[PDB]
């Protein structure tokens, strides 16, 4: 529960950072949904990273997640990272609607894929982290489309449940 | 596959017909629907392969929501009588839906809980996927806003064709 305090943490100054105040463009903020920590290998952006790479290799960074001050529907993820000073930037949008895969990575329990225009190969800090975020990330996808529409989604799952 | 989608037309023009149109108060709007065979002998688990087809029972299943909101969803169970008529015979509310598990090994039979199991099979595996892909991203959209860490799901790969 060092993670739920950790979590808080980089909520506020996520917000604080980056979806508070006009930028200075001076346009209003996109308001923030969630976020999760990762690790990128700057060598192995796009697939499974051998196991032998070298430490330097490994970037800490964030995904987040916000939607569009007048649009509910129109929901961005973001790269950012913190930098030494505390501070928060983000290094990278992407809209979610380039969005056209999602998977986990079989053989290594924090590595995952998404899919836009290119591959990103990320791993989260725990398991359990990841299954939070992919969660996180299709359910808000699905939450995007107007009424009902699921012929255009595809998935794997065989099981459902509220805990 | 073409005489799937012009069954499911029909189906879904006579279910409107019969349960959507009129009124106590005004009638659910109709969402989707899907044909079922329901195992009278065996309603909550997975029937021997060897039932009798004497067990097996031809109804639907219908998702509608409330007039005023989108966001009420219900379930309903039907049957298509032999006059050609259809007629409700039992309906959940969609927050009662607490469990929706694949059959792993019959590619067309899945299980609902609410308070109760219920074991159904659609006619094909294509349809079973259509039907529970309508049901869980339904029961997605009726939260406002990102979804409670309650939810759980075993999957580990999603994809737009």
Redesign the interface.
């Known amino acids: 529960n060092f993670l739920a305090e950790q979590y808080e943490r980089d909520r506020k100054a996520i917000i604080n950072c980056c979806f508070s105040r006009p930028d200075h463009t001076g346009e209003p903020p996109n308001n923030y949904?969630?976020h999760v920590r990762i690790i990128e290998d700057s060598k192995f952006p796009s697939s499974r990273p051998p196991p032998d790479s070298k430490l330097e290799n490994k970037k800490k960074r964030l995904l987040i997640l916000s939607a569009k001050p007048n649009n509910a529907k129109l929901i961005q993820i973001h790269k950012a990272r913190e930098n030494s000073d505390g501070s928060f930037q983000i290094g990278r949008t992407w809209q979610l609607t380039e969005?056209?895969?999602?998977?986990?990575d079989?053989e290594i329990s924090e590595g995952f894929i998404l899919?836009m225009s290119k591959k990103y190969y990320w791993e989260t800090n725990s398991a359990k982290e990841r299954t939070?975020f992919?969660?996180?990330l299709?359910?808000?996808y699905?939450?995007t489309?107007e009424?009902?529409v699921?012929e255009?989604?595809?998935?794997?799952?065989?099981?459902?449940?509220?805990?």
Do not use: A, M
Not at 99 to 104: A, G, M, P, T
């Open positions: 949904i969630t969005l056209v895969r999602v998977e986990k079989l899919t939070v992919i969660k996180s299709i359910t808000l699905i939450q489309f009424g009902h699921p255009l989604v595809n998935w794997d799952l065989s099981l459902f449940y509220l805990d």
